[PDB]
Protein backbone atom coordinates (compact mmCIF):
# COMPACT_ATOMS: atom_id res chain seq x y z
CA UNK A 1 0.00 0.00 0.00
CA UNK A 2 3.20 2.15 0.41
CA UNK A 3 4.25 0.46 -2.51
CA UNK A 4 0.72 1.39 -4.50
CA UNK A 5 0.87 5.41 -3.54
CA UNK A 6 4.63 5.16 -4.68
CA UNK A 7 2.91 4.23 -7.33
CA UNK A 8 0.70 6.23 -7.79
CA UNK A 9 2.61 9.60 -7.52
CA UNK A 10 5.22 8.10 -9.72
CA UNK A 11 1.96 7.35 -12.84
CA UNK A 12 0.63 10.96 -11.73
CA UNK A 13 3.81 12.54 -12.41
CA UNK A 14 3.82 11.25 -15.91
CA UNK A 15 1.38 12.46 -16.96
CA UNK A 16 2.18 15.64 -15.53
CA UNK A 17 5.15 15.78 -17.79
CA UNK A 18 3.13 14.83 -20.48
CA UNK A 19 0.28 17.50 -19.84
CA UNK A 20 3.08 20.09 -19.42
CA UNK A 21 4.79 19.04 -23.06
CA UNK A 22 1.68 19.53 -24.34
CA UNK A 23 0.74 22.76 -23.27
CA UNK A 24 4.37 23.82 -24.29
CA UNK A 25 3.74 22.86 -27.73
CA UNK A 26 0.48 24.45 -28.03
CA UNK A 27 2.25 27.44 -26.52
CA UNK A 28 4.30 27.38 -29.19
CA UNK A 29 1.86 27.38 -31.77
CA UNK A 30 0.22 30.45 -30.43
CA UNK A 31 3.44 32.21 -29.48
CA UNK B 1 4.62 8.98 5.44
CA UNK B 2 1.64 7.40 4.33
CA UNK B 3 -0.34 10.55 4.87
CA UNK B 4 2.80 12.25 2.94
CA UNK B 5 2.35 9.61 0.01
CA UNK B 6 -0.74 10.33 0.02
CA UNK B 7 -0.75 14.30 0.39
CA UNK B 8 1.56 14.00 -3.09
CA UNK B 9 -1.33 12.13 -4.74
CA UNK B 10 -3.51 15.00 -3.92
CA UNK B 11 -1.23 17.88 -4.79
CA UNK B 12 -0.04 16.03 -8.10
CA UNK B 13 -3.62 15.09 -9.13
CA UNK B 14 -4.76 18.91 -8.57
CA UNK B 15 -1.66 19.84 -10.42
CA UNK B 16 -2.70 18.05 -13.38
CA UNK B 17 -6.51 18.95 -13.33
CA UNK B 18 -5.16 22.46 -13.63
CA UNK B 19 -2.99 21.48 -16.60
CA UNK B 20 -5.96 19.91 -18.23
CA UNK B 21 -7.60 22.87 -18.04
CA UNK B 22 -4.85 25.24 -19.30
CA UNK B 23 -4.82 22.55 -21.88
CA UNK B 24 -8.63 22.90 -23.06
CA UNK B 25 -8.23 26.69 -22.94
CA UNK B 26 -5.29 26.87 -25.52
CA UNK B 27 -7.04 24.49 -27.70
CA UNK B 28 -10.22 26.36 -27.83
CA UNK B 29 -7.92 28.94 -28.99
CA UNK B 30 -6.64 26.99 -31.91
CA UNK B 31 -9.60 24.94 -32.61
Known amino acids: RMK ?3 DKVEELLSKNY ?3 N ?3 RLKKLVG
Open 4 to 6: QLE
Open 18 to 20: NLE
Open 22 to 24: EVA
